Symmetry: C4
Amino acid sequence: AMNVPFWTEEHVRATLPERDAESHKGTYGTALLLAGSDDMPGAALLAGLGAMRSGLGKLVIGTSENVIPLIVPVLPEATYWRDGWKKAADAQLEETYRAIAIGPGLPQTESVQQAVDHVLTADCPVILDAGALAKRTYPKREGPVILTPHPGEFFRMTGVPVNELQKKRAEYAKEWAAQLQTVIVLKGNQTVIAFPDGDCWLNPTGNGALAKGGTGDTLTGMILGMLCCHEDPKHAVLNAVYLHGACAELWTDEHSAHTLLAHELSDILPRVWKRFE
Amino acid sequence: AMNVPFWTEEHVRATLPERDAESHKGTYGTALLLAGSDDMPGAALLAGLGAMRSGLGKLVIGTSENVIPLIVPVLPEATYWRDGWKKAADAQLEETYRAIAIGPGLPQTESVQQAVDHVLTADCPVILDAGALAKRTYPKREGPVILTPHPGEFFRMTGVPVNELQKKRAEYAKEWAAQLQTVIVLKGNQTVIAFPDGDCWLNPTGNGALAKGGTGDTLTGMILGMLCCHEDPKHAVLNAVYLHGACAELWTDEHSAHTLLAHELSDILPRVWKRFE
Amino acid sequence: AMNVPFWTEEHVRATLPERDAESHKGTYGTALLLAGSDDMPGAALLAGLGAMRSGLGKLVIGTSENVIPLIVPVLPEATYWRDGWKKAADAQLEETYRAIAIGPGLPQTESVQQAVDHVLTADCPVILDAGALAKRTYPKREGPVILTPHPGEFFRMTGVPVNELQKKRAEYAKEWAAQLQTVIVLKGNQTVIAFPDGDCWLNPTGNGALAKGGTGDTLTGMILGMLCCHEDPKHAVLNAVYLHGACAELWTDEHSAHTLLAHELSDILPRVWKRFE
Amino acid sequence: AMNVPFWTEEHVRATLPERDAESHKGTYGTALLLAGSDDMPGAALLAGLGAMRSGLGKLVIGTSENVIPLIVPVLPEATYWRDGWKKAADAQLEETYRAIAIGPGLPQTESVQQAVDHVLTADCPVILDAGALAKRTYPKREGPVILTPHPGEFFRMTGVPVNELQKKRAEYAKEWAAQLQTVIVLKGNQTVIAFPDGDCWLNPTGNGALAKGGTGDTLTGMILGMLCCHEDPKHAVLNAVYLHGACAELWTDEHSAHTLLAHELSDILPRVWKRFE
Ligand SMILES: Nc1ncnc2c1ncn2[C@@H]1O[C@H](COP(=O)(O)OP(=O)(O)OC[C@H]2O[C@@H](O)[C@H](O)[C@@H]2O)[C@@H](O)[C@H]1O
Ligand SMILES: Nc1ncnc2c1ncn2[C@@H]1O[C@H](COP(=O)(O)OP(=O)(O)OC[C@H]2O[C@@H](O)[C@H](O)[C@@H]2O)[C@@H](O)[C@H]1O
Ligand SMILES: Nc1ncnc2c1ncn2[C@@H]1O[C@H](COP(=O)(O)OP(=O)(O)OC[C@H]2O[C@@H](O)[C@H](O)[C@@H]2O)[C@@H](O)[C@H]1O
Ligand SMILES: Nc1ncnc2c1ncn2[C@@H]1O[C@H](COP(=O)(O)OP(=O)(O)OC[C@H]2O[C@@H](O)[C@H](O)[C@@H]2O)[C@@H](O)[C@H]1O
Ligand SMILES: [Mg+2]
Ligand SMILES: [Mg+2]
Ligand SMILES: [Mg+2]
Ligand SMILES: [Mg+2]
C-alpha cells in the first residue's frame, strides 16, 4: 500500500563490511547481551550464538548465574557479567560497549525496565526485544534504539490489536517508529524495518521454517553482532534481518520447513554470508 | 490375519501439512511435554528434540528442576515449567496447549497418574507413554488420548502376556483401543496404529536400528509435534510413526543398524521429511 | 615368535551379528557400566558412547552422582544407577544384566575391588579396566572375565616390568590369561587378545592416532556393547578390538593421526561397521 | 624492516613429527593446562580442545571446580586437577609434565603470579598467556618460557604503548625476547615469533576471521600440545602458530570471515594438519 521497497540482495552486497587482514578484535568491538533467566535460559544461548556469529570482536553475556553453565560448552568464546541484567537495574554501565541488546528470555517486569533505562544512558546502539518490550517512551540519546516486536509485542507496546496491525503492517510500524523515535523491526513474513527518520524497508527473505520458538532470539543476536561490524547501524539491522531469512531459505532446499531449530540458523549463516561477499 | 492395511508413502504424501509463508508460530501451537526425572533425565531431551523437530510452534517442557540444565545446551528453543509433571499432580492446567505428552522418563507412580488425570481435563490431544502407562480407564473428553506401549507396557495395561500378544498384535491392539476408547500405537516391527473408532493401520517403515533405548521417547515427541501441525490428529500419529521408521531406514543405507543412537533420528528427520513433500 | 594369528577382516565379516527386523531391544540386552568419578568423569561418557554405539539394547550407567549431568546431553539414551559403582561395593547386584563393565575413571582402591567382587557373582561376562585392574585372583564363575590392561596396568597386575613385557607381549599375555583364567586384551600396537583356554590372536588394525587419553575407555564400552549383540563373547571381544582400530585407520585417511579425539571413534564406528556387513 | 623471514610451508612440512605405529601415549607426554575461572570459564575449554587436538598423549586441566563440568561433555578425554591453578599458588608441582600452559581465563592477580613462579620450577617448557602475563622477570631454568601477548598485553608487560609497538613489531618483540630471555609470540596479522637466542620469524598464515574472542586461548592449547609431540620446542611454537592461521584460511574458502567461532579452529585442524604431512 505504501510501496515500501525491499532490502534486496544488491543492497546487502553493497553494504556488508570487509574483515581486513590488518584488523584486530577491537576494530569489531565488544557487545553486551543482557538475556536469559532461570525458566527461559535458552534465549541467552540463541542470542549469544547469533551475536558471535555475526562479526563482533568480543561478547559479554550478562545472564543469570544459573544460565552461565548452559552456555559455555556451546559458546565458550563468550565471557560473562554474572547476574548482569539484574545488576543493570541498579546502576549505570561502567564499561563501554559497541552495542547492547536486552530482553531475550527476560521477564516483562519493572526491574527489566529499570535495566533498560540504565542501558540507554550508554552512547551506543541498543536493541530491545522480548521481555524488554513495553508500552513506554524513550529518551533523546546518541545511538539508535532498535525494537524488535512480533505482532503480539507490538500490541503490548502500542495498543494496536494484532488483527488490525496485520492489515496495515508497514503503516503502523512507520507511524510508531516516528512516534517513539526508535527503529522498529516488526516481525513476520515480509518483516518491516522502520526507521525514525521515515526510511522504511521490507525484508524479502525467509519462510515458515522461522515460525517456531527461538528464531527471534537468534535474530536479536545477529543484529547485535552486525551493529559491531557495520559502520552504519541501519545497514547492520537490514543485513541481519535479510541474512537471517536467507538462512531459512537455504535450510528448506534440502530440509522440511517444519523441522528447523533456531540455533541452526547460526550454523548456516557462515556459508550464507559467504555467498553475499 | 485381519488384513490391516499399511499406512503407505502415498498416504503420507497426501496428508503431510504445508508450512505457509503467511504462517506464524501460533498457527502451529504450543505443546507441553511432561517428561524426565532425576534418574531417567534423558527421555525429556529425546522427546523434546523429537517434538521441536516435528512442526510445532513452541514447546514447554515440564520436567524436574535438575533435568532442565541437561536439555538447554542441546535444545535451547524449549522453555520450561519448573517441576511441571509434579505440579500437574496437584491442579488443572491453567494454560492452553495444542497437544500434551506425558510419561517419558517418569516413574510408574500414582502421582504420575494424578498428573494424567489433570492433563485429561484439557481439551487437546494427549499422549501417554512410558511411566504414564498403567492399567486404568479414561474419561469421555473431546480430544484423543494416544497410548504408546511397547509389548511389556501393553501387558501392564491389559494383562495380555507378551508371548500371547505377539501372536495376534493387531487383534489385541484393536480390541483394547475399542475397550479403552484410546488410540493405541503398539510398538514393534510393523507397529500397529489402532483407533477407537475401529480404523487400524500397520506401519511399514523401520528396522532393528530402532531396537535400542530412547527411540520410543523420540517417537513420543515426534507425535507431539505432528499433532500441532496436522489438522487431523489421526494423520499426525500415522505420519509420526511412519517418518520415525523412515529415519532408521535412511540411517542403515550407510551405517550399521547396530550403531544408531535415538537422538540421531531427530537429526535425520529434516531430510527424510523433505523427501515426502 | 609364537606365530599368533591375526583376527582378520574375513573373521570379522563371518562373525558380526545381524540385527533382524523381528528383534526388540531385549534381544540385545541391558548392559551395566560402572565408571566415572569426580576427577575422572569423562571415562564414563567415553565408555557409555562406545557401549551404546555397539549394538546393545539398553545401558545403565552406575556413575557418581555429579557425573550423571555430564553424560546426559551427549548420550541421553542411557539411564542411571545413582552412585552405582560405590553402591556395588556394598551388595550383590539385584538386577540381571547381559554384560557388565567396571573401572574406567575409577580410582585404584579397595572399595572398587569390593565392587568387582560383587559384580563377579552375576552370571554374565564382566570387563575389568583401569581402576578395577589390580594384582588379584578371580573366582570360578560361568561368564568370562575380560581384563583390558595397557602395559603399565599389566605390570601392576603381574609384576612383569613394562620393558620386559614388551619384548614378549603375546607370551606374557597368554601365560597370565592361563594363570588367572581370564581373557586378557593387552593393549598396544598389535593388541594381544589372549583367552584362558589358550586361544590367542593379534589385532591387525589401528595406528598411533589411538595413542592418546580416552581411547581405551572407548574400547571398554565397545566390548561391553558387542558382548550384548554377539552370541559368542570371544567374537565380541575380537570384533570390538578390530573395529576400534579400524576407526582410527578411517580417521587417518583424511585427518592427521596427531589430532583424533577418542569420542570420535564412536562417531566413526557406524560407517566402519557397515563396511564389514 | 629487519627482514624477518616467514616460517613457510616448506619449514612446516620438514619439521612436523610422525606418529609411529610403535608409539604409545607416554611417547607424547602429559600436558598440564592451568586455565579457566568462574567468569571466564570458556578459555579452559578452548585451550583444552586446542591442546588435545595437537598431538599430546594426555591432558590434565587444573581449573576451578565449577568449570570442570563445562568441559567434560565436549572434551571427555581430559582429566582434572581440581582447583589446580589456585593450588599451584601454594606449592611446587609434584607430578612431572611434558609441558605446562598457564593463564587463559585467569585473572591478572598476584596469586596467578605465585602459581607462575611455582610452575617455573618444573623442568619443562612453559607457556604464559592472558592473565599470567605481567610486567616481571624470569628465572634461569632449563626449559623455554613462551609468552603469548596480544599488543595490549605487550604494553602491560613492557610499557611500550600499542600505537608505538605496532610500528615496529618485530624490533620490539626481538628486543624484549632478548631482555626477558623468553620466547615471545606477539599476536596480530603477521604474528612475530621471537626467540631469546635472537632467532625470529613471522607467521604467514591467518586472516581477520581470527580477530574475535577465544582464538588466542585456542592457540595457547595448540602450542601446548605441539610442545608434547615435537622434539624441538621452537618448531612446536612455529608450527602451532602456522597451522592455527592455516585453519582460519581454510574456513574462509567457503565461510565468511566474520562468522568463525574459535572452537571451530580445533575442528578444522585435523584436516589442515593432514595436508602438511
Ligand atoms: N512465515 C514466516 N516467514 C518469514 N519469517 C518468519 C515467519 N514466521 C516467523 N518469521 C520470523 O521468525 C522470527 C520470530 O521471532 P519471534 O516471534 O521473536 O520468536 P522468539 O521470540 O524467538 O520465539 C518465541 C519464544 O520461544 C522461545 O524459544 C523464545 O525464547 C521465545 O520465548 C522473526 O524473525 C519473524 O519475522
Ligand atoms: N525391529 C524393529 N523394527 C522396527 N521398529 C522397531 C524395532 N524394534 C523397535 N522398534 C521401534 O523402536 C521404538 C521402541 O520404543 P520403546 O520400546 O518405547 O523404547 P524407549 O522407551 O525409548 O527405550 C527404552 C528405555 O531406554 C531409555 O533410553 C528410555 O528412556 C527407556 O527407559 C518403537 O517405535 C518401536 O516400534
Ligand atoms: N600405536 C598404536 N597402534 C594401535 N593402537 C594403539 C596405539 N597406541 C595405543 N593404541 C590403543 O589405544 C588404546 C589405549 O587405551 P588405554 O591405554 O586404556 O587409554 P585410556 O585409559 O583410555 O587413556 C588414558 C587416560 O586418559 C584419560 O582420557 C582416560 O580416562 C585414562 O585415565 C588401546 O586400545 C591401545 O591398543
Ligand atoms: N587480522 C588477523 N590476521 C591474522 N591473525 C589474527 C588477526 N587478528 C587476530 N589474529 C590472531 O588471533 C589470535 C588472537 O588471540 P588473543 O588476542 O589472545 O584472543 P583471545 O585472548 O583468545 O580472546 C580475547 C578474549 O575473548 C575471550 O573469548 C577470551 O577468553 C579472551 O578473554 C592471535 O593468534 C592473533 O595473531
Ligand atoms: Mg521474540
Ligand atoms: Mg518406551
Ligand atoms: Mg586405560
Ligand atoms: Mg588472549
